[PDB]
Symmetry: C3
């Protein structure tokens, strides 16, 4: 059996992060905690979620188990859950997931894991640039860029980190030097990405959340967000466009 | 003449509660206070509003009087009124209603009471189950059920009160025991109702408001809400569906 | 060169006030401060904006300069600016405007002032009535009138200031006596105006902002708003309808 208790905000945020890309997903309850990964239909973005066992109020599992979940449903139900509610998830067999919060108990039929798209592999990306900043600040940068173009360039070097967008008659540059960043290795990298996806990624993040960016040149970017008081790690990987 | 003064929130809430079902209504200014009742077009729900004279800041009437009011208009005008404004209602003759608040005076033509649908009678429902709880908690239960089905079962017995909804692959159960409820008589009852109407009823209620449910088996349910600091009694009665 | 620093709220509010009427505008950086005036396409309303140099945190200009600005763009970009951000505007040449706030630098191509509709002249209106009140209160009056009609009468005399609207079966009167107003000269005047424009004007104002109304009979009304902590003067002039 699986029986865990987590804050409502933790469940709502991780559910929202996953459903942003897929409507169904395999959820692994491992000895070390919860894990889930998925790639979107267009194969342009991937999401990797990790909730260490210590981020849960209670984490009791017998054997490690994988369940198939209808993410659209859990997301819909999560909207009736308060961020301040404590939520208990229970799986006694293999066909039903119980979600309890307040005076309510929701029961949803699980999906056969095999019926879900094959479990994707995590790319062993070798990236030279590492940038650590506030997720809210990043979110604002993307929001500003979104008003100028549908594509942005991420650039890193010894002088800092920049996010640039160019339009027909206007342009915008977000720039932070090493001293302004939380952590920065000065690695040299430059890649271009779709603003649409970046904007969607930021919907589960805000001021106070940590963001670690792993960047290369003409390589997918890794955006590692630490959310909900640092209880969850939500990494989004986005394929690159041609930077020239 | 009729001359009363009430809080903006009191007028806004009671107006909203009535217009939810009808666009016109007879408003009775009785020695004991304000009274109004109406049934919706489909004859599926009824609303009974009572504002005791002591809930008003000022309640001065000569003789008991009944006026016909265009509820869509009062509701529209009430949107320009603040919950913290004090509102004065005046009827000097029989054709005009004056609504004063802030530095504004609104005058609306009254409707001939006779032109309005016959005054409905209050059903003398004999119900075995009585449940008293927080209206906000009830509202949340209905909101959760609404995500699962368009119908819900209300069930009461010695073990408490439950609200259940079932879908094709999921279900939800809200349950509170006698100790969790404010007041409960343990009466046995079970009826099914439309979530659409229940959801609409709850729009004028929130955490802190009292709700008394009178329930029977295959009988209309009585939902007595005490709103605006307990100043108004707004009872909604909803016809049942077949529970089996 | 032009180099000024202002609060985000100041830029956002003045930008919104101007774009309400036009999509392009001439902005004058004078020794005494910023000035801009424009009339809408229908020639029914005009806006005159004045930001004294002392309302800026920094105001450094070489020679007085006039620039042409795409107001739709600045407005769009201003949405990514926080009211609490400090914004720096820089014009080093004549073709580019730099907008800096936070860690972002926006560059927009300027418009040739000549390509913009001829600079309008300020009408030397001679009006007998002067009314000073809270802009938020005025805004509420217009909002109330808007529910009754698409036209309102502004009336002033020794007994105070009134805003009246009449519908088929209802009416509304907003009235404030001399003692209730901040300043009032008791001038006699009566004119009728379009609620649509008045409502739009009030979108940049709120409680706490000062409004000085200059009113005549069958003459355009002057609505002088002092916004953003009294840092900006935004005057709207609205052509009259036939009052009878």
């Amino acid at each position: 059996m699986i029986d865990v208790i987590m804050t409502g905000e933790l469940l709502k945020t991780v559910t929202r992060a996953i459903v942003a890309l897929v409507s169904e997903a395999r959820i692994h309850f491992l000895e070390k905690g919860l894990h889930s990964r998925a790639v979107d239909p267009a194969n342009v973005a991937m999401v990797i979620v990790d909730i260490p066992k210590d981020s849960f109020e209670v984490y009791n599992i017998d054997e490690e188990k994988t369940i198939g979940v209808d993410m659209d449903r859990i997301f819909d139900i999560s909207k009736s859950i308060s961020t301040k509610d404590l939520v208990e998830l229970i799986v006694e067999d293999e066909s039903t997931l119980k979600v309890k919060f307040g005076s309510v108990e929701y029961k949803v039929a699980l999906i056969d894991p095999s019926a879900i798209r094959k479990e994707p592999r995590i790319p062993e990306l070798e990236l030279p640039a590492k940038i650590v900043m506030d997720a809210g600040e990043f979110k604002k940068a993307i929001a500003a860029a979104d008003k100028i173009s549908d594509q942005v360039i991420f650039r890193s070097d010894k002088e800092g980190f920049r996010i640039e967008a160019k339009g027909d008659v206007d342009s915008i540059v977000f720039h932070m030097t090493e001293t302004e960043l939380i952590e920065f290795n000065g690695g040299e990298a430059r890649s271009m990405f779709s603003v649409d996806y970046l904007k969607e990624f930021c919907k589960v993040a805000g001021s106070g959340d940590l963001l670690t960016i792993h960047l290369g040149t003409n390589y997918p970017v890794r955006l590692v967000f630490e959310l909900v008081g640092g209880r969850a790690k939500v990494e989004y990987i986005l394929a690159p466009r041609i930077e020239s």
